[PDB]
């Protein structure tokens, strides 16, 4: 147990902070509540609904984008299950660009998407998660490979193109360390 | 103009229908509702139920601080100063997340990756709120910077030593700029400190007191105890030298504060009276556990090599880095100081080998002789037939 491990800002806290210790007395209201209100907290994920409809009618041909409207109509309804109707349109319209998103370099139903759509989403149907990775493999199915590098290279780049304070800033994951010496020699 | 945030006004609708009144910038309200959770550290061994409880918590916490730091200036201050989730979330996460010199095993890469991104994440929220002057337009005047930042409790001195201790080694230079600015910004860190000190020094004499070296009632010495409460202590020690230590490795100026408190006197003491029995203890029982005692013979030595470097810095921060700058030829308070400090130390002779070893003790003299233009031999002779004397005791 790594919050026993004796830590001098630990008796640090404590001596001043009797108070607050068993203050986090807290565990499932915690985290519950949490869950609660994170139903609106992912505004989106790296590309929207509409920047992937719009990817895919301009790269496949009308041809094929006859099928792939079916299909996302099987992703949309999916979301519609997941995501539920009273937080509205758009908020299904974000649950099926996370669904597709979620599946489009995935060909099955993984413990890692169904603990992912349960994070952002809380408990679901997996029927619908089985639904929508089918409707995506049937979209991916019509891309070709430089296509599909492109829609890597599109999430890859709106997750880059992201900015957030001290972003570009050197920064060091060398922390402290034991110093060596050298063992106790043997004995006698 | 640019006007600082703490005294710019924004208009906003007030619970009157159709009424706008101008209002602080920051306000509670103006804060978001984004829920905070607090940080718990990975399970010991990669048990997989466990693992995936860790995930979850600290895939929340994660994604809060991603949209924190991508919050703007006005906005990002706000959650900071109102919302109390997020002051308690990086207090966890300071206090608990492991440092790398603890006992780590290697876990999946899925926890290794993020952690990775707590660490940077929590690190570069620390240097937003460190700093008072984001850029041109996003600043705040100092005096009411220095008041958030103590009294939203935005920087204890627990989290400065732990933000030390965790971001040292590799971002020194950034980390002391921000230290040294909430402590120019705000000085009754200074003040904290202080009354911070004899709570640190109470840790050294309990240390002695579990040990039974010196109203605990005679507990058993590390030759007795059982093996694992000795475990405790030393990894006890060893965390609270190397927090010290990289405390002051970042921020030296706290030094006089510390010799404020005899410091010297009562790490040199502290030495003397842990180090030789618990290196006994160690070396005796080694084939108790072959692995876990030479584990603490590494912290063990590590914490005494630790001490001396804290002793070093103190001592050169108060005495002779004084004399080196600022040469108007008025340093016999310097000087006397660093005499009498050896004068109160000249008993302790193992600690005063293992210290003149690692910084010898000449060497220093020799630049107060240098600096002062009338030092007598008289003055310094007693402490080097100490040191003289101090290895004669041991074969070496």
Same mark, same amino acid.
């Given at each position: 147990?790594?919050?026993?491990?004796?830590?001098?800002?630990?008796?640090?806290?404590?001596?001043?902070?009797?108070?607050?210790?068993?203050?986090?007395?807290? %565990?499932?209201?915690?985290?519950?509540?949490?869950?609660?209100?994170?139903?609106?907290?992912?505004?989106?994920?790296?590309?929207?609904?509409?920047?992937?409809? =719009?990817?895919?009618?301009?790269?496949? %041909?009308?041809?094929?984008?006859?099928?792939?409207?079916?299909?996302?109509?099987?992703?949309?309804?999916?979301?519609?299950?997941?995501?539920?109707?009273?937080?509205?349109?758009?908020?299904?319209?974000?649950?099926?660009?996370?669904?597709?998103?979620?599946?489009?370099?995935?060909?099955?139903?993984?413990?890692?998407?169904?603990?992912?759509? =349960?994070?952002?989403?809380?408990?679901?149907?997996?029927?619908?998660?089985?639904?929508?990775?089918?409707?995506?493999?049937?979209?991916?199915?019509?891309?070709?490979?430089?296509?599909?590098?492109?829609?890597?290279?599109?999430?890859? =780049?709106?997750?880059?193109?992201?900015?957030?304070?001290?972003?570009?800033?050197?920064?060091?994951?060398?922390?402290?360390?034991?110093?060596?010496?050298?063992?106790?020699?043997?004995?006698? | 103009?640019?006007?600082?945030?703490?005294?710019?006004?924004?208009?906003?609708?007030?619970?009157?229908?159709?009424?706008?009144?101008?209002?602080?910038?920051?306000?509670?309200?103006?804060?978001?509702?984004?829920?905070?959770?607090?940080?718990?550290?990975?399970?010991?061994?990669?048990?997989? !139920?466990?693992?995936?409880?860790?995930?979850?918590?600290?895939?929340?916490?994660?994604?809060?601080?991603?949209?924190?730091?991508?919050?703007?200036?006005?906005?990002?201050?706000?959650?900071?100063?109102?919302?109390?989730?997020?002051?308690?979330?990086?207090?966890?996460? @300071?206090?608990?997340?492991?440092?790398?010199?603890?006992?780590?095993?290697?876990?999946?890469?899925?926890?290794?990756?993020?952690?990775?991104?707590?660490?940077?994440?929590?690190?570069?929220?620390?240097?937003?709120?460190?700093?008072?002057?984001?850029?041109?337009?996003?600043?705040?005047?100092?005096?009411?910077?220095?008041?958030?930042?103590?009294?939203?409790?935005?920087?204890?001195?627990?989290?400065? @030593?732990?933000?030390?201790?965790?971001?040292?080694?590799?971002?020194?230079?950034?980390?002391?700029?921000?230290?040294?600015?909430?402590?120019?910004?705000?000085?009754?860190?200074?003040?904290?400190?202080?009354? /911070?000190?004899?709570?640190?020094?109470?840790?050294?004499?309990?240390?002695?007191?579990?040990?039974?070296?010196?109203?605990?009632?005679?507990?058993? #010495?590390?030759?007795? *105890?059982?093996?694992?409460?000795?475990?405790?202590?030393?990894?006890?020690?060893?965390?609270?030298? /190397? /927090?010290?230590?990289?405390?002051?490795?970042?921020?030296?100026?706290?030094?006089?504060?510390?010799?404020?408190?005899?410091?010297?006197?009562?790490?040199?003491?502290?030495?003397?009276?842990?180090?030789?029995?618990?290196?006994? !203890?160690?070396?005796?029982?080694?084939?108790?556990?072959?692995?876990?005692?030479?584990?603490?013979?590494?912290?063990?030595?590590?914490?005494?090599?630790?001490? *001396?470097?804290?002793?070093?810095?103190?001592?050169?921060?108060?005495?002779?880095?004084?004399?080196?700058?600022?040469?108007?030829?008025?340093?016999?308070?310097?000087?006397?100081?660093?005499?009498?400090?050896?004068?109160?130390?000249?008993?302790?002779?193992?600690?005063?080998?293992?210290?003149?070893?690692?910084?010898?003790?000449?060497?220093?003299?020799?630049?107060?002789?240098?600096?002062?233009?009338?030092?007598?031999? #008289?003055? #310094?002779?007693?402490?080097?037939?100490?040191?003289?004397?101090?290895?004669?005791?041991?074969?070496?």
């Amino acid at each position: 147990e790594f919050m026993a491990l004796p830590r001098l800002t630990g008796a640090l806290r404590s001596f001043s902070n009797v108070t607050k210790q068993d203050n986090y007395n807290e %565990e499932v209201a915690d985290l519950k509540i949490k869950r609660s209100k994170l139903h609106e907290q992912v505004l989106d994920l790296g590309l929207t609904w509409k920047k992937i409809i =719009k990817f895919l009618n301009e790269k496949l %041909e009308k041809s094929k984008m006859q099928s792939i409207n079916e299909d996302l109509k099987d992703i949309l309804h999916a979301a519609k299950q997941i995501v539920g109707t009273d937080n509205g349109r758009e908020a299904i319209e974000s649950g099926a660009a996370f669904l597709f998103m979620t599946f489009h370099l995935k060909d099955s139903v993984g413990h890692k998407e169904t603990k992912a759509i =349960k994070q952002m989403f809380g408990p679901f149907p997996s029927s619908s998660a089985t639904a929508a990775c089918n409707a995506t493999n049937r979209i991916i199915s019509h891309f070709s490979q430089d296509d599909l590098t492109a829609l890597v290279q599109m999430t890859e =780049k709106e997750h880059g193109d992201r900015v957030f304070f001290g972003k570009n800033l050197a920064f060091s994951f060398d922390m402290h360390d034991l110093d060596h010496f050298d063992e106790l020699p043997i004995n006698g | 103009p640019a006007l600082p945030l703490d005294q710019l006004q924004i208009t906003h609708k007030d619970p009157k229908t159709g009424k706008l009144r101008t209002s602080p910038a920051l306000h509670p309200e103006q804060k978001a509702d984004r829920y905070f959770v607090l940080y718990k550290p990975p399970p010991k061994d990669n048990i997989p !139920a466990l693992v995936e409880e860790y995930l979850e918590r600290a895939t929340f916490v994660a994604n809060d601080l991603d949209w924190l730091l991508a919050l703007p200036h006005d906005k990002f201050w706000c959650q900071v100063i109102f919302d109390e989730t997020l002051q308690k979330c990086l207090d966890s996460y @300071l206090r608990y997340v492991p440092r790398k010199f603890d006992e780590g095993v290697a876990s999946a890469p899925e926890v290794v990756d993020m952690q990775k991104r707590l660490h940077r994440s929590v690190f570069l929220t620390f240097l937003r709120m460190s700093t008072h002057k984001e850029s041109k337009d996003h600043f705040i005047s100092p005096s009411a910077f220095g008041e958030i930042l103590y009294n939203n409790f935005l920087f204890d001195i627990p989290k400065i @030593l732990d933000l030390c201790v965790l971001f040292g080694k590799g971002n020194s230079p950034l980390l002391q700029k921000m230290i040294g600015n909430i402590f120019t910004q705000q000085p009754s860190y200074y003040s904290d400190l202080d009354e /911070t000190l004899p709570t640190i020094l109470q840790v050294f004499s309990n240390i002695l007191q579990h040990c039974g070296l010196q109203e605990e009632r005679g507990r058993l #010495t590390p030759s007795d *105890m059982p093996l694992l409460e000795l475990k405790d202590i030393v990894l006890y020690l060893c965390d609270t030298c /190397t /927090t010290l230590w990289a405390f002051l490795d970042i921020f030296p100026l706290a030094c006089q504060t510390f010799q404020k408190h005899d410091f010297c006197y009562r790490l040199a003491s502290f030495y003397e009276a842990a180090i030789p029995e618990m290196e006994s !203890a160690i070396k005796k029982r080694r084939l108790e556990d072959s692995k876990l005692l030479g584990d603490l013979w590494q912290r063990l030595s590590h914490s005494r090599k630790k001490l *001396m470097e804290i002793f070093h810095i103190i001592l050169n921060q108060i005495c002779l880095l004084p004399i080196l700058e600022s040469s108007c030829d008025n340093i016999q308070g310097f000087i006397e100081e660093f005499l009498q400090i050896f004068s109160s130390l000249l008993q302790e002779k193992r600690f005063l080998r293992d210290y003149d070893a690692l910084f010898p003790v000449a060497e220093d003299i020799s630049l107060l002789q240098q600096a002062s233009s009338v030092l007598d031999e #008289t003055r #310094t002779a007693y402490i080097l037939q100490a040191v003289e004397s101090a290895w004669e005791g041991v074969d070496r």
